[PDB]
Amino acid sequence: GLGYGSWEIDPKDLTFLKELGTGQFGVVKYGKWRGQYDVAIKMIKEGSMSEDEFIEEAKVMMNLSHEKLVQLYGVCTKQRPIFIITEYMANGCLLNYLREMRHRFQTQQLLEMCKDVCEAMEYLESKQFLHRDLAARNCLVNDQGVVKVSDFGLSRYVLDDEYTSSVGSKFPVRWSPPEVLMYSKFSSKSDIWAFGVLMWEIYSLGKMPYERFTNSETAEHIAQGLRLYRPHLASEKVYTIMYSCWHEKADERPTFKILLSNILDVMDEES
Ligand SMILES: Cc1nn(C2CCOCC2)cc1-c1nc2nccc(-c3ccc4c(c3)CCC[C@@H]4NC(=O)c3nc(C(C)(C)C)no3)c2[nH]1
Numbered sequence: 229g230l231g232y233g234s235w236e237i238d239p240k241d242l243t244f245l246k247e248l249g250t251g252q253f254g255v256v257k258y259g260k261w262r263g264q265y266d267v268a269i270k271m272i273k274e275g276s277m278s279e280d281e282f283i284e285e286a287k288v289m290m291n292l293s294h295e296k297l298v299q300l301y302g303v304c305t306k307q308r309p310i311f312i313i314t315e316y317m318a319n320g321c322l323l324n325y326l327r328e329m330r331h332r333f334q335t336q337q338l339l340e341m342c343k344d345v346c347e348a349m350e351y352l353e354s355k356q357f358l359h360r361d362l363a364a365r366n367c368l369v370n371d372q373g374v375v376k377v378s379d380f381g382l383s384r385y386v387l388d389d390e391y392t393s394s395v396g397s398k399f400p401v402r403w404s405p406p407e408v409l410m411y412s413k414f415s416s417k418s419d420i421w422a423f424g425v426l427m428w429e430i431y432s433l434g435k436m437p438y439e440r441f442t443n444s445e446t447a448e449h450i451a452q453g454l455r456l457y458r459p460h461l462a463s464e465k466v467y468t469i470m471y472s473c474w475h476e477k478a479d480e481r482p483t484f485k486i487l488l489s490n491i492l493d494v495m496d497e498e499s
Pocket residue numbers: 248249250251252253256268270314315316317318319320321361366368378379382383386
């Protein structure tokens with residue numbers, strides 16, 4: 229009503245029910261909107277976000293819609309802390325889901341998770357919109373086992389130098405290409421490299437990439453041409469696709485449209 233924009237949700241319409249976890253912007257909770265509809269609510273901790281810049285960008289993010297992207301519903305900005313309201317995903321983050329051995333996933337199921345994420349990324353690529361922190365920890369799973377991409381773009385609004393600096397403790401070193409580590413040069417092709425590492429995470433059931441190395445050692449080894457190698461559950465055809473993401477030259481890595489075609493082809497050959 230009066231005083232609320234299209235983007236704005238009235239926080240008094242929210243009921244808070246459970247805590248889901250804590251991350252870069254603070255606490256995230258599960259709740260209901262108008263006593264009926266499941267939602268997730270990010271409560272943005274004081275000092276953690278460039279708030280005015282995010283609010284202006286939220287207008288662009290409200291127009292991004294795809295079945296394999298976590299859906300933004302709105303924001304609450306007339307009070308602090310500000311809230312970000314999204315679709316609720318009942319089975320939690322992909323990294324923890326992969327690590328639960330009781331699921332005993334079949335190889336067909338693993339390739340379907342890769343396809344879910346590739347569909348989302350092809351859509352963002354079509355709108356020239358980078359994720360910038362693609363990894364299994366930033367994907368979520370719903371009650372039907374469908375994987376969706378979460379928190380795309382939000383890296384631009386983090387005020388913590390240990391996350392933003394390429395030599396900081398929280399920087400995603402193990403998901404980054406050589407030109408990001410050396411010159412901090414981000415592009416569609418750095419999202420491509422990260423997607424290859426995510427495919428490796430899926431087929432490895434959530435092991436840490438380069439698990440015997442530090443971040444510093446990983447950066448040096450990548451520069452010398454070392455790469456991750458084939459997980460036991462990945463076929464030769466699947467490993468070819470993930471490895472194509474790691475070409476030293478950025479312009480020789482595929483697009484997400486090409487990767488999606490390749491994944492569909494392997495599904496037809498291995499199903
Ligand atoms: C967990 C969980 N368990 N369960 C069930 C499992 C079965 O038993 C009952 C509980 C459900 C969930 C669950 N559903 C969800 N739906 C929507 C969103 C979230 C969500 C998304 C992101 C984050 C969290 C939560 C919590 C930790 C921090 C994290 N990152 C950011 O906040 C952040 N990171 C960045 C960047 C990438 C910019 C650093 N920005 O914000 C959801 N979590």
